[PDB]
Amino acid sequence: VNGLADDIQKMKDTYEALTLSNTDVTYTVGQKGDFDTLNHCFEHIEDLIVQPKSI
Amino acid sequence: RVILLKDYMMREQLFLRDKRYNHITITSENDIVEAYETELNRQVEIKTNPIFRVKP
Numbered sequence: 001v002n003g004l005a006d007d008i009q010k011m012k013d014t015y016e017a018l019t020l021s022n023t024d025v026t027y028t029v030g031q032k033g034d035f036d037t038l039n040h041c042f043e044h045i046e047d048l049i050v051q052p053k054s055i
Numbered sequence: 056r057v058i059l060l061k062d063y064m065m066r067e068q069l070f071l072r073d074k075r076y077n078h079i080t081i082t083s084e085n086d087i088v089e090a091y092e093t094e095l096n097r098q099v100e101i102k103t104n105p106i107f108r109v110k111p
Contacts, residue, residue: 026061028085 017049024054059083065090068097068111 027034027041035041045055061084098110 024062024064026085028061 014049020048020052021050023052025052027055057081059085059088061085063088066092066094068093068095070097 027045029035029038029041035044057079059081063083065088093110096110098108100106100108
């Protein structure tokens with residue numbers, strides 16, 4: 001049952017990633033930021049399925 | 056308390072006139088709030104010994 005729930009959550013994530021196109025983003029790099037180092041932040045950006053309007 | 060999220064980019068002018076807003080506080084999740092090109096250019100002229108028009 002938890003596997004089914006995780007599949008549904010992955011589906012939520014995929015839909016949000018697809019619809020992310022027409023929004024804008026703001027990633028914060030630092031100790032308390034979203035990403036630990038700048039290398040992580042641009043590894044995550046390169047993995048985005050659809051590039052948002054303005055990162 | 057008005058909190059500006061980390062996604063907010065300032066692109067409009069906030070004009071308050073005759074509003075007793077003692078209590079309100081404006082805070083941002085970010086340290087700096089950037090200000091981009093405002094959509095509508097509203098300028099206020101200051102009538103003083105040197106006349107200078109400002110867009111705040």
